[PDB]
Design a protein around this nucleic acid. Structure first.
Lengths: 89, 122, 80, 81
RNA sequence: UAAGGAACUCGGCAAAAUGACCCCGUAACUUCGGGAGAAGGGGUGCUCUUUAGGGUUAACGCCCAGAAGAGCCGCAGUGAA
RNA sequence: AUGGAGAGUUUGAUCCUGGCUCAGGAUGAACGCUGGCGGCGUGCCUAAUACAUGCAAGUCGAGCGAACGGACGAGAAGCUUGCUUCUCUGAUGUUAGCGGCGGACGGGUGAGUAACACGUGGAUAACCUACCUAUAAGACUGGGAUAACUUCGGGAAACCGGAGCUAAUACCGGAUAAUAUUUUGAACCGCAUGGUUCAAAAGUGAAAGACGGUCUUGCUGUCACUUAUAGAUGGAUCCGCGCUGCAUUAGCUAGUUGGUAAGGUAACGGCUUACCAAGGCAACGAUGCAUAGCCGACCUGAGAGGGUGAUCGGCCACACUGGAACUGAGACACGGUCCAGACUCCUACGGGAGGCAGCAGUAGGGAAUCUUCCGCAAUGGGCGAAAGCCUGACGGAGCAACGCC
RNA sequence: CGGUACCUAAUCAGAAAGCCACGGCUAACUACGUGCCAGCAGCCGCGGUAAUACGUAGGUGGCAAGCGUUAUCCGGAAUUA
RNA sequence: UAGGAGCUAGCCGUCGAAGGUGGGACAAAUGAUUGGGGUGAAGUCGUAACAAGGUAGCCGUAUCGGAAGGUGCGGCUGGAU
C-alpha cells in the first residue's frame, strides 16, 4: 500500500535518510507522496529524529501503514505514542 | 525421372530456389535420375543474400519426385513436385533447414543429416 | 464545476447543426517581443442552429458529443 | 529456464478459464436466448427477467463482468420491461 | 500420351498454346496521330426472390436483364464449332 | 545590467570590406609517452548484432487432501538385551498437488514515435480502481468432483496418450436487505443535462481454519469472506500553448466531411454499419517526405539565451519478428498461451527445445568503455502474524588518472 | 564491507614526476652536423656550407602526475547583426 | 433418446498478418568504357587581356573557328580624339 519508508542521501558509505510516505509500487528512491521528515541513525550518539507528526494523523487513518522499521522508531521516539491517543478516538 | 534440362525447386535454405540439371551422375549414358540420386546442376533463381549465388554449378540430391519410387513390398509413393537439396560433396547439406516431406530411401545413401532435419520422413 | 467558456464568431455552419466559430488573438516571438495576430478556430456544437452569420458567439466547452463537437452554445449576440 | 509458476499458471488458468468459460459462456448462452425470448411479448413477457436479471447479477456478484455492464444489461432489459 | 519441356534442328520447321463477349488496368518511346487489343488481371451455367432497368413498358408480366441478393449442380458453365 | 580587449591575414605602401586562422574554456573523450597514495564520481557512445553456461519472483500447514520419510507409546522379542521388524499415538519436515496472492514489481533499452508523445495550464454534468484505511450490511443452504492412489501404453530420451478413484477457507445450485435497476414527481447550468431526497417489479452475498480462554465456543481477535459509502493509488478520456526541416513537397481527404438510428465504452462519437449534401482540409504550406523518444536537467553565454542527455530524475514506447486472445482489479504479459515466420540447439531419428535490451561472461564490430566478483548486514519490495525465501534490486569489493580534491 | 579504514610505536632523508618550444607573436639560446636534403610548419616561414627555426646536446620556461596530439560544442565574434 | 434451443463438432461467407508473385516506382552499390572539372608539373606552342598592350571595351544575342578569337545587330561607359 502507501507506506512510510527510508529514502537515503549522502556520499560513500554514509546515508542521510529523509523519510517518505508513498506507495510500495514505486521504487525506493522513486516519486513520492509526502517527504515528512528525516532520520539519520548512523551518528556517534543520536538518531537525529526530526518528525512533523501532524500528517501521520491523516494518512495512518485512511490508508497508510507503518512497515516493520518505520513503525518502531515511532514507538521509540514517541511519534505513534501521540498517535496512541489519536488512534484512541 | 529427372533428366537433363529439368528444373527442380530447391527444398532447403541455402539461397537457391530453382535449379536446372546438367548431368545425372552414375555411368556412361545414364539417362534419368530419381529419389536418392545425385545430380549436378545450375542455379537459375537465387534468394537475395544466401550462400549460393545465381550461375553457380553445384551438386544436389533428389528428394521428392513426381514419379516416385516403388518399394519392396509393392507399395509406392509419389509426390506433387520435384525438389532437390544442394549438398557439400560429403553428403552434408549446404543449408540448415529442409522444407517439406522427404522419402525414406534417403537413408540408404547415408544422407542422415538431410533425413534428420526434415519435417517427417515419408 | 463549469467548463471552459471561450468566445468566437462563426465562419461556416456545416450541414445539419455544426457551426464553426473563429477565435484569434496575439502571440509573440519571445526572441523579439513583437506580438503578432494569429487564429485558432475551436469548433462548437450548435444545439438548435442558434448562431447566425455575423454573430460574435460565446460558447462553452464540453466533453465530445461527437468527433469534433467539443464545445456547446451559451451566448449569441447579433446577425448581419 | 522457465520457473514452476509459469508451468503452474498455464494449467490453473486452463481450469480457471474453464470456470470462466463455464459461466460467461452460460451468460453468453443467456444473452443469446433469454434476450431472444424476452422480446416479442412471449408467454413470460414480464417473468423472463427473473432468470435474466438473476443471472446477469450472478455474473456481477462475482468477478465475471463489470457492474456497469450489468447496468448496461438492465438498460435494454427493463426498457422492454 | 507417363516423367521431362527445345535437350530436336541449319533454324522451335511442324504442332501445341492464344482467341468470343463484359469489367478492371496498361510502359518505354513518339512526327502528339500513335504505340494499344501493350503487357497484365478478373468474370460467364441454372433456379428463385426484386428494388428496376433496355423497358415489351401498358409494368413488374413480353424477352433480354438494371444488376443486386439468396440458392442448386457438375471434373469442367462463350461446357460443341 | 559583476560582462563585451584579442593575434594575424589581400601591397611597392595605405583605408575599407571580407572570409579564414589561432590564443581561452570544456569531453562518457581516446591515443603517444609518463606515472605516489588515499577521499571521491563515471563507467559499449558503435551491432535494437548474435549468444554457451551460471542466474536472476516468489509466497504460505496457521487452507486440505494426500502420500513419503519420520521422532512418537511402540508388544511379543528378531533372544544376536537391541532394536521399532508389527500395530496404532504419529508431530515436524519432504513433497507434489489442489488453493489464494503475485506475475503489469524491482531490472533493462531508446528501435518506433515530429506526436497530446512529452512538458505545462485547465476539465470530465465521460471516469475507473484488487489490495490499504475508515464507514455499515453480515456471514444461512446443499454440494459433485478433483489431482494425489491404482491401471494400460509410448519412447535412451524428453514428456505424454487412456481406465477407475480423492480434500478444502477451492468450487457450483436455493431465498435474504442495499444511492443497483427502468417506471411514476418536487433541485440548476453545460442546450443535452445535474441535484437528493423521492417510490416501486426487482437484485445476492456467504469462508471457513490454527487458536488466547471460554461454552466440546465467541465477539470470529488472527485473515479473510461478500453488500452500500468514502479516503487513497495509479491510469483513462477532452481543449489551451512550447515543440525539426523541405513548395527542387500545393491542391489534401471520400466513412472522409457534418448530421441521421444500433451498438459500448469506466464514457464519447465517422469508431463501424443503412441515410442525406459534397462537404470538410488547406500557401498561416493541409498533404507527403526526411530526421528525432519528450521534459526537467546539463552547458556556456553581459542579458537577449540557445546547443548536450553518458549523466540524474519524471513521463512515453519495447522485450527474435508479426498477428490473436486468455487470465488477472490492473496485460494484449521482458524468465505466460496459441498461430505464422525466420534463426539456433539436442536426438537412440520417435520428436523434443530456445529467445541475455534482468547481472556478469562470450564472440563480433569498434579507437574504446568494468569481475563468467562478494554479501543481503542496512534499506526496499514480494506472500506469510511472525519466523523464513527471493534479491544479478540494493550495500559493498575489483579495474581504469577517464575525470575532481 | 573488515580487522579494511584508524591509533601506536620502530624505520631510512627512504623507493617517485614528465613533456613542448627556445624565430615574431610567446617569457625559456647556444655549438656540431646540415646544405631547400633530412626535416619542422597555429599565420608569417627556417634549411641553397656561417639555421638561434631542422636533427643532434647543457641551461631555462610554462606546471605538475601529467605533457602533447587528434576530433567534438561555446566564448572570443554584433561572419545572421 | 440426448430429437429440438443452444453448445463441441459440421459446413457457409465478411475482414485478415504474413506469404506468393506481379508490374512498376523510389533509393543505394557496381559496371568494360567514357567527358566535364580540380591540383601538380605548367613538359609544350601562341601571346589573346593589362600601356589608345600594336587592330578601345562591355552586356544581350547570333555565327564561324579546336581554342583564343572572328563578325553582326540593339543597348551601356566601366574609353582615346
Amino acid at each position: 500500500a502507501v507506506k512510510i519508508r527510508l529514502t537515503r542521501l549522502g556520499s560513500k558509505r554514509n546515508p542521510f535518510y529523509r523519510i517518505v510516505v508513498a506507495d510500495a509500487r514505486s521504487p525506493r528512491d522513486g516519486r513520492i507522496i509526502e517527504q515528512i521528515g528525516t532520520y539519520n541513525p548512523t551518528s556517534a550518539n543520536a538518531p537525529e529524529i526530526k518528525v512533523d507528526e501532524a500528517l501521520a494523523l491523516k494518512w495512518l487513518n485512511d490508508g497508510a501503514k507503518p512497515t516493520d522499521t518505520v513503525h518502531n522508531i515511532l514507538s521509540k521516539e514517541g511519534i505513534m505514542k501521540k498517535f496512541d491517543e489519536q488512534k484512541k478516538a | 525421372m529427372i533428366q537433363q534440362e529439368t528444373r527442380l525447386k530447391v527444398a532447403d535454405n541455402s539461397g537457391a530456389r530453382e535449379v536446372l540439371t546438367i548431368k545425372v551422375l552414375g555411368g556412361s549414358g545414364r539417362k534419368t535420375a530419381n529419389i536418392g540420386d545425385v545430380i549436378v546442376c545450375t542455379v537459375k533463381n537465387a534468394t537475395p543474400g544466401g550462400v549460393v549465388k545465381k550461375g553457380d554449378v553445384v551438386k544436389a540430391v533428389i528428394v521428392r519426385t513426381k514419379s516416385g519410387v516403388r518399394r519392396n513390398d509393392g507399395s509406392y509413393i509419389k509426390f506433387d513436385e520435384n525438389a532437390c537439396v544442394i549438398i557439400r560433396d560429403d553428403k552434408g547439406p549446404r543449408g540448415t533447414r529442409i522444407f517439406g516431406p522427404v522419402a525414406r530411401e534417403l537413408r540408404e545413401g547415408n544422407f542422415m543429416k538431410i533425413v534428420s532435419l526434415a519435417p517427417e520422413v515419408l | 464545476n463549469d467548463r471552459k467558456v471561450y468566445v468566437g464568431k462563426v465562419v461556416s455552419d456545416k450541414m445539419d447543426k455544426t457551426i464553426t466559430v473563429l477565435v484569434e488573438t496575439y502571440k509573440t516571438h519571445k526572441l523579439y517581443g513583437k506580438r503578432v495576430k494569429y487564429s485558432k478556430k475551436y469548433k462548437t456544437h450548435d444545439e438548435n442552429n442558434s448562431a447566425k452569420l455575423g454573430d460574435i458567439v460565446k460558447i462553452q466547452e464540453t466533453r465530445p458529443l461527437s468527433a469534433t463537437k467539443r464545445f456547446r452554445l451559451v451566448e449569441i449576440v447579433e446577425e448581419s | 529456464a522457465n520457473i514452476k509458476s509459469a508451468i503452474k499458471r498455464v494449467k490453473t488458468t486452463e481450469k480457471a478459464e474453464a470456470r470462466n468459460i463455464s459461466q460467461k459462456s452460460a451468460m453468453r448462452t443467456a444473452v443469446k436466448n433469454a434476450k431472444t425470448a424476452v422480446s416479442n411479448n412471449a408467454d413470460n413477457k414480464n417473468e423472463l427477467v427473473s432468470l435474466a436479471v438473476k443471472l446477469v447479477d450472478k455474473a456481477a456478484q462475482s468477478n465475471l463482468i463489470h457492474s456497469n455492464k450489468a447496468d448496461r444489461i438492465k438498460s435494454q432489459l427493463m426498457t422492454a420491461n
